[PDB]
Design a protein around this ligand. Structure first.
Ligand SMILES: Cc1cc([C@@H](C)Nc2ccccc2C(=O)O)c2nc(N3CCCCC3)c(C#N)c(=O)n2c1
Ligand SMILES: Cc1nc(NC(=O)N2CCC[C@H]2C(N)=O)sc1-c1ccnc(C(C)(C)C(F)(F)F)c1
Lengths: 1054, 279
């Protein structure tokens, strides 16, 4: 039982025929074939069946149909009983179209939930109950503590706390308004519009306030109360008492979407309100009685599920020896491969704890070694996160004296389990395929543990026995051993500064020492850290506390294969000052496997990471879950509790975990995690099922258009799409659910006249929904989402995330470069959603509308001419300025990241002049990993077009005062990102295990060291940037002959 | 240990190469292979010894102050060979105890026929072209083979899923046969005892329908298991074909990277290395 191979309604069939024959197996042994509609509910089918069943022998033996339920086999190989009989036949995921009639047993509500959960996580929860692994069963039970703990924190301050969970405030991370946003106000004031639905008839009433941006929602309500009852003749004392009594009896909500102002932040800190300052948009809020909202809130009821002699390591005086016994098979041609051998190594993150050890060489057809491998490490020196990395390697040497080694299949193993027990006895490990592009012999970054796929080479090992269970020592024993070894090792004589100064005197407070610790901590995380600097950092480890953000580099300077050194490091981290999250997240990547370090990193997140920043880094924080040794850890317990107490976090927590459930390397870890989230998140699971079911209908419908109907015309495919979305099973699923891109938006009835299949080859679906909000006319009357099945969206998702962080860095330094990081969520294997940007067009669409019929070569002024026509008069200067600041930020963003092919097809412009880039998918210059050149000459095609706009149409654009201002924005912005180069290396570093082709090893991330000139000084970097931009110009002598195909007329010059 | 030892012909002098250029040259080589790049100290002077011990390159920074050359303060060496090169003879444990191994295989520039093995002067001036053409052709063959490998992996996994669904489906139809014999037997003995004959054949006829269904499904699993066996073997052969190309493709990538410095004598033009080197 796995997930699903296809998203079709039957095994091997995308669409059931409008009427289908269903085998029914009655309780009396009879078998009845029954023609059912594919959209028939199980209620209907059972009714039709029991009427048809009277025509069959032994019919009087059947009870009433209310005493039976259906059971059948689903495409996930599961024996599913269907208690919820409201479900249509085509949405049962039946393997074969048959149904067995049985009497229902057990708790109906429990079994309905376990299906809803299994459907949402893409994996039947009965598969978890089948696992013999004690760590899996321990995780399922023990993690319920986090669930109960969070549900109590929700229902503690009822009903306000339940409203905070369901509708968390969407605020910026800081209330301080940078001065270029404050001066966009009117003397620090903003005009808001408060709406009220007054009704026997649902009429709408308007009150216009003018308030400071510091107002808490209670004061905005209070000012509304004031303006309302000023005409209502009242005494001053009653009015001052009327405002004071009823200000906390109402709440404020954004008109159009479900974003409430439930908490006491200043008004301008709310993301909707700060945005309206930037865009110069009129805020339209909706005031409702606080009790009218608490009535909508569903009662979240959480139910506990059904499944709810040791010698110390440090007294084992022996060296580590592991036995390589044999391997089942390897797939090599005996005539082309000489011999095979198992290559081993003991690792801590990425660094070996001793010399790698190889087995003897054996022939391929007989992989048996029976060979003890003896390692250069003592058993008590093994760090907590110590692992065994191995692989089967083939060797062939047919040319001269040179020899060729190649890895065949690999596997990693934690040397202690989740209970701190040193592995013992025999152990069989199923190896993994060699990743594409990997040429090394070992793979210490890949996932630990056996391949769940058991139809692979199976390498048998044996570990040593010590006549007792060996446990990693307790933390009390580790700290005590360090106290009498931290002052017994560090503090001898002064001559210990010239042999191995890891034993020097402990008060060197010189500046040459203090200023080197400053330079070391500011180096980028990918820089080489040398052996002296490791000895130097370690020798001054006690002063590193004064510069606490050096902790990453000091941790790479500890000798992890020495228990005495590690123990001292444990005591230093125990009391280490918490540091900012942007630096604690580095300790959570693949480079820091130790539990005590990662604990510290999580304690810094509990202390400084706001829910807004957790939503900002959620991608990376889910990714690093793959690097945790065990299922039960401090990072997941922190992430789980946070998602269980903020539904906006839990939404994207679900989807990002769900998105990777196809990757079998982590599908169990994320499955077990998604289960415990689903089982405890409260009412949101139902909302998610409407979302999950909505996507499956779109995946199945796009599979058809991409496979069966691929050879048909657009008009015939479009005909097929219309008739499919009008079926009752499609209208039920694709209407009335929450947009996965942004759950604040409600998707109502489909506007089928606006839905279409987009022309591109992946068959994207352009989908349009009504907005069921009563104030939908003031926000989005249209919710437009593009569904794409065929392309990997993770790069687009990462690039867009990065772009948003760059925009924050520029805002904090007074640089107003307006980006547009549109929505993009990946919902599974090469399938996801894209938020549409209303009233925006590609540069090509604007030139195709310029123009002059049959242009072949577009004129350079069409874009500037379009902007003049859209922003005539006084609003012209505000539009040109927006185009300038928006073009500048993307220019620097696309250079630092290496996003290529910037032309009129993936650059878009809003009517009001804001420019933004779309379609990334390829960054860090990874097409050139096969050729070598990381910098040639690819002139930006749209220079002259943009220069005309920036220079407001001057004839000689390069000499205008406006272009010189444009250069300074890019120069200032580029250095701004360069000053934060450690964060972006850290973010990409957290994404290594995700499986993106452009992001496989740390050498892939090294591209931004060159574009950010991290090996230079600040002046040499800026000169480097001006040169790279100068090379990337474009001017008169352009070989512009064709724009569709880009043919080039004569002048071949040969 | 000589009369005069020069700076250029030393195997480690690379000039202004970056950190990434060092990663390519120090990989899977034998004891004794090392190189130098520009030091992390912004001043000129530092030379780096890189010894492979247990398959690891240890980085040891030599802090550089004043116009002298050495390891640490004060930089008081007399020749560069004493600094880095002479370690080839005696043990390297005096430098750092983390590299207790010697230096045996030198990748020599003048041992050309050991790496550059073309016979005539006309055949040498193409070994970068021949090695790169062999890389791009065999890389895309392995690319095409790996895409069949991942695809066949998915299809094989789906057949195992469909087989487990057949096993449970067959498990369920088997119960319907054993349930029918429980109920009908108390009646087939009675409908003979009650003279009813239409009812006897209807129960037999209905059990014949169940018979035909189970027989058709078992055959449907049989044809799936037959197809699983053949594709699992087709898979193993796809792996054999890749595992024979993989070690040859690894060397061609390193060989082409080795020959990047060799074509200096047959210098193919600069932008020509945008077509004489690939595209
Ligand atoms: C008006 C303008 C100018 C440039 C270049 C030619 N010029 C400069 C750019 C910045 C700062 C100074 C100059 C400077 O030469 O003065 C430009 N380049 C772009 N790309 C992407 C990043 C890599 C280079 C090519 C994009 C896009 N996408 C873009 O919109 N561009 C817009
Ligand atoms: C963020 C965004 N916004 C848009 N808005 C319009 O396309 N509009 C807006 C209304 C008319 C119509 C137009 N100009 O024609 S498209 C878009 C986007 C982002 C990323 N990729 C794409 C495509 C087209 C490559 C994909 F993936 F959908 F195939 C589009």
């Amino acid at each position: 039982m796995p997930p699903r191979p296809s998203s079709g309604e039957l095994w091997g069939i995308h669409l059931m025929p409008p009427r289908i024959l269903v085998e029914c197996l009655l309780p009396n042994g009879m078998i009845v074939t029954l023609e059912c509609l594919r959209e028939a509910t199980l209620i209907t089918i059972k009714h039709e069946l029991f009427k048809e069943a009277r025509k069959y022998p032994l019919h009087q033996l059947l009870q009433d149909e209310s005493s039976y339920i259906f059971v059948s086999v689903t495409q996930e190989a599961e024996r599913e009983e269907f208690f919820d009989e409201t479900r249509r036949l085509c949405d049962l995921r039946l393997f074969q179209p048959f149904l067995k009639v049985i009497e229902p047993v057990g708790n109906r509500e429990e079994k309905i939930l376990n299906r809803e959960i299994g459907f949402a996580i893409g994996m039947p929860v009965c598969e978890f109950d089948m696992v013999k692994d004690p760590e899996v069963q321990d995780f399922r039970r023990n993690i319920l503590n986090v669930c109960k703990e969070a549900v109590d924190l929700r229902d503690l301050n009822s009903p306000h706390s339940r409203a905070m969970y369901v509708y968390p405030p969407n605020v910026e991370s800081s209330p301080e308004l940078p001065k270029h946003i404050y001066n966009k106000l009117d003397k620090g004031q903003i005009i808001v519009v408060i709406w009220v639905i007054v009704s026997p008839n649902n009429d709408k009433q308007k009150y216009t306030l003018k308030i400071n941006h510091d107002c808490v929602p209670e004061q905005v309500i209070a000012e509304a109360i004031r303006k309302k009852t000023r005409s209502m003749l009242l005494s001053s004392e009653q009015l001052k008492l009327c405002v004071l009594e009823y200000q906390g009896k109402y709440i404020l909500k954004v008109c159009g979407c479900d974003e409430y102002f439930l908490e006491k932040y200043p008004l301008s800190q709310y993301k909707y309100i700060r945005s309206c300052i930037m865009l110069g948009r009129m805020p339209n809020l909706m005031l409702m009685a606080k009790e009218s909202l608490y009535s909508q809130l569903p009662m979240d009821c959480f139910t506990m599920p059904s499944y709810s002699s040791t010698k110390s390591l440090w007294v084992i005086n022996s060296a580590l020896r592991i036995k390589i016994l044999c391997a089942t098979y390897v797939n090599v041609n005996i005539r082309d491969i000489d011999k095979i051998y198992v290559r081993t190594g003991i690792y801590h993150g990425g660094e070996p704890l001793c010399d790698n050890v190889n087995t003897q060489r054996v022939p391929c057809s007989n992989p048996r070694w029976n060979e003890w491998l003896n390692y250069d490490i003592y058993i008590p020196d093994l760090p907590r996160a110590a692992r065994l990395c191995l692989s089967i390697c083939s060797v062939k040497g047919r040319k001269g004296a040179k020899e060729e080694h190649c890895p065949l299949a690999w596997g990693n193993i934690n040397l202690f389990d989740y209970t701190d027990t040193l592995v013992s006895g025999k152990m069989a490990l199923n190896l993994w395929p060699v990743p594409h592009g990997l040429e090394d012999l070992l793979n210490p970054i890949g996932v630990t543990g056996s391949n769940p796929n058991k139809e692979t080479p199976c390498l048998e090992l044996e570990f040593d026995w010590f006549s007792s269970v060996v446990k990693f020592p307790d933390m009390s024993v580790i700290e005590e051993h360090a106290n009498w070894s931290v002052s017994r090792e560090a503090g001898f004589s002064y001559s210990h500064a010239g042999l191995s100064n890891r034993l020097a005197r402990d008060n060197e407070l010189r500046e040459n020492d203090k200023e080197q610790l400053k330079a070391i901590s500011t180096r980028d995380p990918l820089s080489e850290i040398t052996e002296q600097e490791k000895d130097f950092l370690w020798s001054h480890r006690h002063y590193c506390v004064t510069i606490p953000e050096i902790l990453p580099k000091l941790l790479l300077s500890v000798k992890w294969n020495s228990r005495d050194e590690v123990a001292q490091m444990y005591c230093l981290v125990k009391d280490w000052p918490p540091i900012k999250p942007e630096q604690a997240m580095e300790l959570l990547d693949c480079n820091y496997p130790d539990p005590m370090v990662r604990g510290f990193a999580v304690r810094c997140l509990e202390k400084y990471l706001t829910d807004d920043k957790l939503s900002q880094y959620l991608i990376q924080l889910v990714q690093v879950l793959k690097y945790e040794q065990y299922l039960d850890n401090l990072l997941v317990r922190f992430l789980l509790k946070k998602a269980l107490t903020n539904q906006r976090i839990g939404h994207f927590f679900f989807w990002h975990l769900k998105s990777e459930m196809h990757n079998k390397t982590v599908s169990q870890r994320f499955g077990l995690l998604l289960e415990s989230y689903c089982r405890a998140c409260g009412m949101y699971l139902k909302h998610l099922n409407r979302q999950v079911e909505a996507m499956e209908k779109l995946i199945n419908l796009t599979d058809i258009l991409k496979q069966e109907k691929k050879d048909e015309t657009q008009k015939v495919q479009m005909k097929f799409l219309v008739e499919q979305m009008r079926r009752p099973d499609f209208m039920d699923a694709l209407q009335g659910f929450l947009s996965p891109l942004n759950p604040a938006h409600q998707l109502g009835n489909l506007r089928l006249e606006e839905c279409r299949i987009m022309s591109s080859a992946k068959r994207p679906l352009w989908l349009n929904w009504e907005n069921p909000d009563i104030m939908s006319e003031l926000l989005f009357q249209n919710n437009e989402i593009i569904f794409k099945n065929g392309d990997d969206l993770r790069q687009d998702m990462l690039t867009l995330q990065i772009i948003r962080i760059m925009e924050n860095i520029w805002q904090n330094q007074g640089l107003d470069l307006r980006m547009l990081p549109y929505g993009c969520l990946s919902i599974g294997d090469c399938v996801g959603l894209i938020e549409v940007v209303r009233n925006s067009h590609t540069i090509m669409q604007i030139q195709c509308k310029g123009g002059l019929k049959g242009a072949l070569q577009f004129n350079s002024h069409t874009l500037h001419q379009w902007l003049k026509d859209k922003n005539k008069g006084e609003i012209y200067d505000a539009a040109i300025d927006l185009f300038t600041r928006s073009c500048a930020g993307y220019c620097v963003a696309t250079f630092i990241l290496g996003i290529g092919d910037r032309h009129n097809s993936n650059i878009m412009v809003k009517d009001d002049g804001q420019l933004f880039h779309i379609d990334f998918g390829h960054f860090l210059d990874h097409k050139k990993k096969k050729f070598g050149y990381k910098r040639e000459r690819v002139p930006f095609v749209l220079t002259q077009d943009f220069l005309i706009v920036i220079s407001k149409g001057a004839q000689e654009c390069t000499k205008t005062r406006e272009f010189e201002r444009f250069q300074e924005m890019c120069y200032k912005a580029y250095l701004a990102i360069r000053q934060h180069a450690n964060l972006f290396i850290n973010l990409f570093s957290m994404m290594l295990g995700s499986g993106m082709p452009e992001l496989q090893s740390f050498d892939d991330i090294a591209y931004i060291r060159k574009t950010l000139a991290l090996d230079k000084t600040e002046q040499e970097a800026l000169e480097y940037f001006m040169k790279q931009m100068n090379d990337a110009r474009h001017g008169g002598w352009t070989t512009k002959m064709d724009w569709i195909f880009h043919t080039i007329k004569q002048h071949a010059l040969n | 240990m000589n009369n005069n030892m020069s700076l250029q012909d030393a195997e480690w002098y690379w000039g202004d190469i970056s950190r990434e250029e060092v990663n390519e040259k120090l990989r899977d080589t034998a004891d004794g292979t090392f190189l130098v790049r520009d030091a992390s100290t912004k001043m000129h002077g530092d030379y780096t010894l890189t010894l492979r011990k247990g398959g690891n390159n240890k980085l040891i920074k030599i802090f550089h102050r004043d116009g002298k050359y050495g390891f640490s303060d004060p930089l008081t060496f007399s020749s560069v060979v004493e600094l880095i090169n002479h370690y080839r003879n005696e043990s390297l444990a005096q430098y750092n105890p983390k590299l207790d191994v010697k230096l045996l295989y030198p990748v020599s520039k003048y041992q050309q026929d050991q790496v550059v093995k073309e016979d005539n002067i006309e055949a040498v001036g193409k070994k970068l072209h021949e090695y790169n053409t062999q890389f791009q052709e065999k890389s895309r063959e392995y690319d095409r083979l790996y895409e069949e490998y991942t695809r066949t992996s998915q299809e094989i996994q789906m057949k195992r899923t469909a087989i487990e669904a057949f096993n449970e489906t067959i498990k369920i139809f088997e119960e319907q046969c054993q349930t029918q014999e429980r109920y009908s037997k108390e009646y087939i003995e009675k409908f003979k005892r009650e003279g009813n004959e239409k009812e006897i054949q209807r129960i037999m006829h209905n059990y014949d329908k169940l018979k035909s269904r189970i027989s058709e499904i078992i055959d449907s699993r049989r044809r799936l298991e037959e197809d699983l066996k053949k594709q699992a073997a087709e898979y193993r052969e796809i792996d054999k074909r890749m595992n024979s190309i993989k070690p040859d493709l690894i060397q061609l990538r390193k060989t082409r990277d080795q020959y990047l410095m060799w074509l200096t004598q047959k210098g193919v033009r600069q932008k020509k290395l945008n077509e004489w080197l690939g595209n």
